[model samples]
Target: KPGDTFEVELAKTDGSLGISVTGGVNTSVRHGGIYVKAIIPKGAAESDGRIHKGDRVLAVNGVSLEGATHKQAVETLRNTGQVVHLLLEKGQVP
Candidate 1:
């Protein structure tokens, strides 16, 4: 299942991408990557409909999340422009 991948372009609304994530380098999750935990209602991700809960975010913009920590990923997502480009892998953590 890790082989499945897709790209989602989400434009921020009121400066919020409206998604929560878990897992990353040094985390307790089975896998070491940023996984979408929940999509906020009426948020960018939810409205876009490409991303889903449990999808791993392989990259943001052009930055790879290969060895990024959770906080690092958060910062990268937060610092992006109005439009966010996400490379997501469709799969479960374990």
Candidate 2:
């Protein structure tokens, strides 16, 4: 984790994209910033493993992703892709 931030999980395929919050932990915690969301139909998000919309990110490879902004988190997740390890939160699945 980068300063309590969630790192990237390197995997074979883009299984799940990381949805971190760029804003403060308080806001990102509630999808205020760059939280996890499900991918849309036939959209980049959906084709990219659909890690947003209905995914509740538990941890960033055991790190607490509490306060991150939307732009910050989204950018990291986009570039890192499956390279960052993310613990799926309970009921994050849609």
Candidate 3:
């Protein structure tokens, strides 16, 4: 089921996307790529309802996160504009 993909667009609330992620390179657990760890309450992701915990974030904006480090992915998501577009795969890393 890893082939399933979807897009989620979230508008930042006071510069915060209200989501947390884990994994990526140099990590001891879930190291293959970035995965959604949690969805903050009253946040865009929570309101959107399409994104869920354990979803793999494949890209941000138009930038690929295929081999990006955790910090790199954070920077990419942080540096974007108000409206952020995320390409997510539906599943947890196994």
Candidate 4:
């Protein structure tokens, strides 16, 4: 929670950035469960340099994802409206 985290800003665009997500398990209690499985090219998030596959989304718009269900996290992102700021933990990449 205190180390190895980074921030990303998602600007409002014509469409959603292509991203496949997982790891927001219903049973998780910590680690803000959402993990990025893939990033589709030519999307808003893909154009951003900071986000990557395997990165764990720890928060959305300053709200912690820890202990939150996948639905809750999704709602938070949805409710944030335009300009979603994400706090993420970058994971290992090869």
1-94 per-residue lDDT for model 1 (tens digits): 4558788777898888878877787877656788888988978887777787877788899888978888988888879898888888878545
Per-residue lDDT of candidate 4, residues 12-65 (tens digit)? 466575555666656553444777778878867777857778787887788877
lDDT of 1 at 67: 82
Best by TM-score: 1
Model 3 Cα lDDT, one tens digit per residue, 24-72: 8777765578888898888777667677887888888878887788888
Clash count, predicted structure 1: 0
TM per candidate: 0.86, 0.43, 0.83, 0.73
Query: Per-residue alpha-carbon lDDT of model 2 for 19-60, expressed as tens digits?
Result: 333443454255442344444455433445524444455455
Cα-lDDT of candidate 3: 0.79
Cα-based lDDT for every prediction = 0.81, 0.45, 0.79, 0.70
Estimate the lDDT of model 2: 0.45
TM-score of 4: 0.73
Is candidate 1 or 4 superior in lDDT? 1
The number of the candidate with the highest lDDT is: 1
